RNA sequence: AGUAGAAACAAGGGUGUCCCCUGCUUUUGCU
């Protein structure tokens, strides 16, 4: 009614008639931003200067008929003069205060339901529990965390479609929501937001902020989680740690852990299967985590885990180009190498057929408990800078790096035959055979590896073969960095191919992931996991 | 056939059809069988929808409600919007693809088709393409055949007959043109078009003129680059290059660095916006917080507390000014204060009369008239604005004394921080106690008094400048403090008269006349007060320990100026605190990360740890953590008060020399490529600023002390 | 806390 | 005395 | 006892007290008058560093251009611009060899980018030069003016909305024999081919303000709308290339830069007892943007885009060509004064070509005499250099290539080098068995840089054992130390509005705690100071206080009216409940449970007139200018309330002849606002449609009326009335 | 005079001493 009346009044005038009748809808995106107002170049100075004026604020014309011209003290609240470049009217902050003390009161019941993110933040803080303060040297590792607890891991486009359906139902267009999770979210939000007077744009913005996973590269000192990073300023410090437990659980962490557990179990059961590829594909399409089919989670969940990467690549999707060895992810930094096949003899008089890498190279190795950077030459180790939570993690990192170096010094350190097999009773490749053998025990290797003196430099320390810190002695090219060795930020997503044995090979042919690289650790699921396939029965 | 189709349809129908086919990006002059098919579809659909209304009860109507809603012949956006709205409101699920129209009587979507082929073939094709069971499908034939779902025809027999007749007559017309046989409809193939971006004309010439010297065309350069393989080019050119092009490392040893060369000239003079060490305040015990009462009433009360007013007389005249004007300005201020006193009503602000003395002192009508160049090109003395370097000044000994006095402790607290949320976490309790220590050490520092005075003065100046740009406004210099006995005091330093303040640019200047009380005789350090006209306005009987001693009380009167940017940055001087405190905090925390405990209490209550912070004739002097905090606070405050591009340049250049000296101290074997250039860059920033000169002198002292 | 300095 | 915040009765 | 804070460095290492050396509590230097002198000095310096080049007269613009590419090799250590094409090509080839497939994949990604980017992407600029108005205008306004002028001149390929189509329109307009423009009393002006060509290649020069650490002001340039798209595509390609290089510090943030620097430093430093020395250079290049040549960038792009479609190569190549044929405006001009007559006047820079030299002083006279040969149509011809310097990512690629040339397989010597590069800045590390090898490696790097046109500032650089260094004000001393002063200007009232300012202050404190090692007590005192400054700026002191302000009466009345005082916002005289634990909570939600029902309903009333919602991209988004670097976008968490108002704009334009645009602007808003009343989603996702505004509006009105009537929410009389009105509008559209 | 520093402010426009308009808008780039 009033819309057509406004359109008629607009069509009355000639210039605006031409503007309306000669500009296409696409041109709206440009002419609406058309403005003579230069972007402010010193907002602080401008605000300090303008708050000393009489009418610094702008308000809609309705304010004229909504609040009185003058206050009880004859203090003017709004002025008739229009704001430059619009029909808004200049008004004073006294007008805002008068509104707050005398304006039309309205029931605010959807606000907690619309701004759910902030209210969840405050509830989590209120229900949290604190602990003691530990004054000690703090080791901070820079890691890519996700500062957005409580989101439904919906991408930009799916989030946009859900927001369009919820807030602007008639403008959905040609898209029909398919994933039952999206339908559930849409129906829920439509029910909660029914009869909501808040401006549609703010509701859409809040839904987008709540449903999309954000990320930042931050120096985390302790645990990583959407609820622990959120309160990072209050937990970690330069020289102190504040023990704290947020008073709330977030479904995203639950689904992440449950997906990790399910992928690990499914790959473990697929290794034994006669057809690992077909069995893995069937298990992927025939399982549910917390009422959600795993196929939908996999295409959207960005969590990184060898089992998760194997499952994601099985159906066919881009994965990180860094290769998995010994439970560590290796991302190449500089240099290059060529694969040369060779034969080698161990200290137990056994022939091993290995594929050595010839050439200078640099890698960054990231593990669950420790991380390092490795400068490696052809069949020789140049440098290994490592840092871990505790001594055992550093030991595991050093072992995997030493095995990866392919040096003959650790080859002749082998004692006994290498007869390691997988769960399916199949012989492993020589590299993983050596890795397992040295993981069982490493006294001989660490003793029979080498010893060289070092320079005492701050932030660095040595390790002896018995794995005790030293200040004047260390191994060959191995140094423990007291300060956390920062991990990589971005990893290239590349096409890969998977054979019938779940060995993931890239275009160059090198193997990135394999079931033998999946950890044997078994945790407790946070969400109920159900398997509809015949094998898991 | 284009004429046959165009002339045999309603202009609106052809317009809709052509717009619809253009929406896909096709060329109407190229594909026309599609055009004919879509135009026939539009015509049949319009006949289907037209001549059909619904009355109030919901029955048919043949000549208000429209029985049929059209979907074809519309932009994809509008069609999708209308179908989505219909599906939402009616409840019928929307189809995957776009139907042709919608019917309200039966409340379902119906598809219309016109095909030369038999009805069954196209019916099956469309039905198995859309794959919908709740949408009607109606197929027409050029030969009169027609069929809908379950053989159920929605439209009346008369409407179907009319549609068939229209189709038959248009087919007869097309056959009369003879192209009916060679029509065979047309289907959408969704072609893909490769991109192209050609460089031709003027731009090709520009490209040909934007290549290395040896190439004449862009194509030749492209061919050369594509067929390029690295063949010792860099190595050959390195061999060819002269050996004089090298980066020779100069060893930086303990005997390498030399003291900075300070500029020579007349001694530097005071340039702050208010007195710092010589300020005298008249105080009254008033139980009010910062910025509570009326400034003018407080000023009058403070003035009342002083007896011993004397007839003003020039003591130290302004060399380049008109001192009688300053005397008259002070007399006028006194008279106006008396007038407001004998009024029984104190307004928030007072506007001074625009007398001749204030007109001169505040730079009234000093801007040259603005004229067009064509009107004054023949003027003999018309020339460019003076843009020479500022005259050089030598460092004077008063700036060091100012800094020394700014680092002292005061008998009154100067900062009353606001409240914050209550402590709930142990780390918050530790932070609260640490901040209590900090604010205790900082609340009684003269630098904090300078911070508060500057913030108040700049805030008042900015507010007055914005509020009254055309009036000479009087502003008292007022501060609030708490004595060591806990009694609140309001102090008056002096007065400021703000002139016209039509400030447009952030660098535009507003002039003001500042008259401040003091007890220091200017004649002891005349060079420091070259910009001032100092008067004597009384003899104060100071209360010393032995007894009472009478001393003259002087009024330092000067003309100063400030810009919007300077006032704004003076309003934010409080953040200076943060700087110092941050530096202090990191110093404690670092030492607390080795002892596994908080040493804040130890540092602040035992004074066992000291840092070298000053210089004495015996050597380097060390101070406590509180002294270090006060010194850093004073340095930050003086940086705020004496900001200038010279300070920025000196800081930036001397940072590198400090880092090089530190590397030498760390035994890292530093080396320089051009140390003389660095020294020249540092020295170019020392011209006349007393603060920068003092910083350079400090650097020289540190250099002497850090290399032995 | 009552700040104090030797000077 | 203090040449900034003295006492003058 | 004389207090000397510098002496503190005798005990605390300089890095550990580096914040003491940053005087960022005072105002930064500002330019007061014209920038013409700096621009002329820049042009003369650019033509002096490459004066041993080939002089050519452009056939199109008729301008004198200087070509130093493949010129005489340097013979001294002064800045040089004689880059060698083959050396640059070899550097690019070796960069490709070190990272095979980098160029191909980056080209594919950027090519996918090109076909999808929209013309509206150009609106996210800042004060673009407007050749139509011949002055700086906001990016969106400049784009709209350019589109209108193109349309009036029969250049309508940009209706498709693709940026590449707009580039095709620019290409075609370049060949037009006559351009028609409209100048405000609308008047028509005709520009010949050469005039329009010079206008399209012009850069508006001004002076930079609020720069720290410099004693002398310097000039910056801003291009027009004719070159923005080409530069955007070139920068997208450069960004794609840089992302894949471990030695490139762009476009990653501070944390990633610190991680990369730590990784490289630890990699190089660590060695056994005595096998090789490592020395880090904290280098800095001199006249970086005055010695880089657009021709070298063209060679780099040509090599990068090998074995690619021709159209892609042309699109990527247009930008270097335009930059090679650029012209620079000489600022506002000068101001003359007369003491005897007490007069002042403005002399436009357009007149400097033939003005008497008796007015100017010695230095300005010399500058004018030196630059006179290059002047054309009031603009100076500047072929060499990169004055504007908007190729910040290709220069990073060149620096990374020079760094990568330091591998042991490329030096073929005992010495080698590695490090990080960030456009102009760079940190180097050279490893060699002895000091002689270190000197040899440093000399090799310096000479290669000279060959590639990069000049290292020997005055601003030093070398020391690789334990401590600096990089873009990040100070590393066996680990990165805190530099709090760098962020000091961020601690204050941002100046957006009450709610946004509170949110931004709290967030800034939280982030400086997380990243810059801000102490707990320092954070608490920063909160106290921010609350004080906020209260004073917005005159929202506590209701019970006796502070005299224009807003005191209303706040006092609201305070006495309220029952639960702890629920009021600080903007309404409420108390401050923020502390370290809850620095991540918006204020409205922080004290939601303590607010009165009436006050809560009034404050959170979606029917208030003070809240205006623009496109979603600006929701809870603010522009913040840091102490160093360009302005950034910051997202803050806040609930939209009556305190989210918008401050008034500048009205000076009302007194000029450009006021016509103001009126025009208002008209647009009306239409745009009306569109929102028919397409409420239009503010969330940009609508698309070729039909006119009126057609879509009338169609939607018809459908909405029909649907609402069928739903029974409107009586037939109202539906008939609106149907009649819509018919009236539809018929009035034809006439 | 004063601010200030490589160029500026010390009000600028408008209309016929009053009145009207303006306080970033002939000048603030780029990842
Ligand atoms: Mg630099």
Numbering used by the authors:
A (entry chain C): 1 to 537
B (entry chain A): 1 to 63, 72 to 716
C (entry chain G): 22 to 28
D (entry chain P): 8 to 16
E (entry chain B): 1 to 184, 206 to 756
What does the paper say about this structure?
The viral RNA dependent RNA polymerase (FluPol) is a key determinant of viral host-range and pathogenicity, and a prime target for antiviral drugs. It is a ~260 kDa heterotrimer composed of the subunits PB1 (polymerase basic protein 1), PB2 (polymerase basic protein 2) and PA (polymerase acidic protein). A direct interaction between FluPol and the disordered C-terminal domain (CTD) of the largest RNAP II subunit is essential for ‘cap-snatching’. We show that the CTD, jointly with ANP32, enhances FluPol replication activity and we demonstrate in structural studies that CTD-binding to the FluPol is consistent with replication activity.
A second structure was obtained at 2.9 Å resolution where FluPol with PB2-C mid-link and cap-binding domains take a replicase-like configuration (PB2-C(R)), with the 627-domain remaining flexible. A third structure was obtained at a higher resolution (2.5 Å), in which PB2-C is not visible. These three structures show FluPol in the pre-initiation state mode A, with the 3′ end of the v51_mut_S template (3′-UCG…) in the active site and the priming loop fully extended and well ordered. Importantly, a replicase-like initiation complex (PB2-C(R)/ENDO(T)) is observed for the first time, characterised by the radically different position of the cap-binding domain compared to the transcriptase conformation, which was never observed during extensive studies of cap-dependent transcription. Continuous density between the two sites, with 25 connecting residues coming from five CTD repeats, is observed for the pre-initiation state and the elongation structures, whereas for the replicase-like structure, the connectivity is lost between both sites. We suggest that the final step, ENDO(T) to ENDO(R) is more likely to happen after PB2-C(R) is established, which liberates the PB2-NLS domain so that it can interact with ENDO(R). Furthermore, we suggest that the full replicase conformation (including the otherwise flexible 627-domain) is only fully stabilised in the context of the replicase-encapsidase complex.
